[PDB]
Design a protein around this ligand. Structure first.
Ligand SMILES: *[C@@H]1O[C@H](CO)[C@@H](O)[C@H](O)[C@H]1NC(C)=O
Lengths: 15, 177, 183
């Protein structure tokens, strides 16, 4: 019962 | 209308099973990759002058840099083990027909490995054989069309031999005038 | 290109400002394993094999789209609001199997080089719009970061039928009508 994961994108620091 | 597009592509590249795995995340604005993490490089890198702000901010934060490097294991290597249990075992056998200028249609097969040989009587045809590229059907099946550019003589037998990872024996289909 | 046995897309994340729309899907070797219905909040696998053995929590997709929504506003300002360029899409129509009159078959309309990912794919029989037996894939990624989509039409080949695939895109001056003949 392995739940697949994705790549978590980084967040820009503008506002 | 005026549209703005953003894309994020977490791509994993597998060679020789899981012996050579590589993670490339891509940060794309419209059709322009401006930043990227490559597991070979180890840190974020700007691709265009649009990405030094993001790349330097992401690299400065220790928690972001570790969670991205660990994705080679938590995402790429982990999901591949689920591919071996499902996608990489899929075996759809191809249907092979011959129809009139002679076309050996090979349809509805998976995976992509395929080998089509035309035979004129007892001699494999090696010249006038026009093969279309692999046609992806988009429903997890492929097809391919292979033409033989000669049908001169009557009494000659033309056979098409198709090999596929799903077949222990090749499929042979014959045509005659 | 990069040499590998298998290429995996464990995160084809997409967000665009036109009618605020997005998409999340995993691809393996050029095929979509699943997408997430963002409004229904449901993982939609593409094969009966995956529905049985595979699980993906749709909450992670919604988290990523919110981050892409955020980054897009940042990069829009850094780029001085540089909008996307409309590419000219290429359309091809072909059958899934050799067409034998009377035997069920499926028509395949491949639209390629789609950018931005906004397009209308519609089928028509010979004079009326065909709504039954029509299915479509999600936007599939390409290396050059354009998209391609495929629409299907389940039909029964007959003598009095010539089908057409209608593609509507901003990069096209007029709608494209791709032609397929049973003969
Ligand atoms: C697609 O169809 C809708 C109506 O259903 C229309 O509003 C939109 O402009 C079309 N997209 C095109 C022509 O690119």
């Amino acid at each position: 019962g392995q739940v697949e994961l994705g790549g978590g994108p980084g967040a820009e620091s503008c506002q | 209308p005026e549209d703005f597009v953003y894309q994020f592509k977490g791509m994993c590249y597998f060679t020789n099973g899981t012996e050579r795995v590589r993670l490339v995340t891509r940060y794309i604005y419209n059709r322009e990759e401006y930043a990227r993490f490559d597991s070979d490089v180890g840190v974020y890198r700007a691709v265009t002058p649009l990405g030094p702000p993001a790349a330097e901010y992401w690299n400065s934060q220790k928690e972001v840099l570790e969670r991205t490097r660990a994705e080679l294991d938590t995402v790429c290597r982990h999901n591949y083990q689920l591919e071996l249990r499902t996608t990489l075992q899929r075996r759809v056998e191809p249907t092979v027909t011959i129809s009139p200028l002679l076309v050996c249609s090979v349809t509805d097969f998976y995976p992509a490995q395929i080998k089509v040989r035309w035979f004129r009587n007892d001699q494999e045809e090696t010249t006038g054989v026009v093969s279309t590229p692999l046609i992806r059907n988009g429903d997890w099946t492929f097809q391919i069309l292979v033409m033989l550019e000669m049908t001169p003589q009557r009494g000659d037998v033309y056979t098409c031999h198709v090999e596929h990872p799903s077949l222990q024996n090749p499929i042979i289909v014959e045509w005659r005038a | 290109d990069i040499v590998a046995d298998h290429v995996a897309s464990y995160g084809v994340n997409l967000y665009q400002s036109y009618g605020p729309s997005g998409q999340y899907s995993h691809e393996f070797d050029g095929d979509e394993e699943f997408y997430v219905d963002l409004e229904r909040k449901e993982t939609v696998w593409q094969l009966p094999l995956f529905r049985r053995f595979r699980r993906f929590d749709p909450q992670f997709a919604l988290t990523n789209i919110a981050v892409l929504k955020h980054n897009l506003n940042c990069v829009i300002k850094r780029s001085n609001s540089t909008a996307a360029t409309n590419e000219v899409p290429e359309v091809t129509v072909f059958s899934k199997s050799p067409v034998t009159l009377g035997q069920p078959n499926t028509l395949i309309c491949l639209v390629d080089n789609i950018f931005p990912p906004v397009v209308n794919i519609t089928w028509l029989s010979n004079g009326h719009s065909v709504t039954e037996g029509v299915s479509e894939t999600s936007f599939l990624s390409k290396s050059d970061h354009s998209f391609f989509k495929i629409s299907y039409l389940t039909f029964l080949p007959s003598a009095d039928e010539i089908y057409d695939c209608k593609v509507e895109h901003w990069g096209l001056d007029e709608p494209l009508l791709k032609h397929w003949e049973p003969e």
